[PDB]
Swiss-Prot record:
Phosphoserine modification, residue list: 38
Lineage: Eukaryota, Metazoa, Chordata, Craniata, Vertebrata
UniProt-recorded name of the protein: Adenylate kinase isoenzyme 1
Known role: Catalyzes the reversible transfer of the terminal phosphate group between ATP and AMP. Also displays broad nucleoside diphosphate kinase activity. Plays an important role in cellular energy homeostasis and in adenine nucleotide metabolism. Also catalyzes at a very low rate the synthesis of thiamine triphosphate (ThTP) from thiamine diphosphate (ThDP) and ADP.
Compartment(s): Cytoplasm
Organism: Homo sapiens
Length: 185
């Protein structure tokens, strides 16, 4: 069955601002043959598709309303169905932002294999990079950390969280990423 979805590798990739997790996903693509997905890319793709789903989405966005999670997950699942025979695994870049988005992904598609937490860390030198006021930046970072900690705590209970220190270079981050992915199966 498309129960294959329950056997592929599914990595939730989570990181605050300045985390560079987009670059890490592509480096995982090059090395491990995974597929880089994000809900933003699928929405742009679908609107460009001219499909009825895309016309509705543009309407919702002309509406200024919210896109329903069910439609997001239809698109994620379609994209994963089309590549689970030809891909070694999937990166969900920037997902989930809340516990229930994670739980709804699991219901519709399959349970995550890992949650990769790419943490540039709070204000150490992340603050200075985020310009190029500075209390707009601190307000932004703490609201990220408040929203993301229940997601981390939730998946910590399953023991699938792998935390990556993203203070240093791109190369030192991908070093830790490969340690964590090399441990799978």
């Amino acid at each position: 069955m498309e129960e294959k979805l329950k056997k592929t590798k599914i990595i939730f990739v989570v990181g605050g601002p300045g985390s560079g997790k987009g670059t890490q996903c592509e480096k995982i693509v090059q090395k491990y043959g995974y597929t880089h997905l994000s809900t933003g890319d699928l929405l742009r793709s679908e609107v460009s598709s001219g499909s009825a789903r895309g016309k509705k989405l543009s309407e919702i966005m002309e509406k200024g309303q919210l896109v329903p999670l069910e439609t997001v997950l239809d698109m994620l699942r379609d994209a994963m169905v089309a590549k689970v025979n030809t891909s070694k695994g999937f990166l969900i870049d920037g997902y989930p932002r809340e516990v229930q988005q994670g739980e709804e992904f699991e219901r519709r598609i399959g349970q995550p294999t890992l949650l990769l937490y790419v943490d540039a860390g709070p204000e150490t030198m992340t603050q200075w990079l985020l310009k190029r006021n500075e209390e707009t930046i601190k307000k932004r970072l703490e609201t990220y950390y408040k929203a993301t900690e229940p997601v981390i705590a939730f998946y910590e209970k399953r023991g699938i969280v792998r935390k990556v220190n993203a203070e240093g270079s791109v190369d030192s981050v991908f070093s830790q990423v490969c340690t964590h992915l090399d441990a799978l199966k």
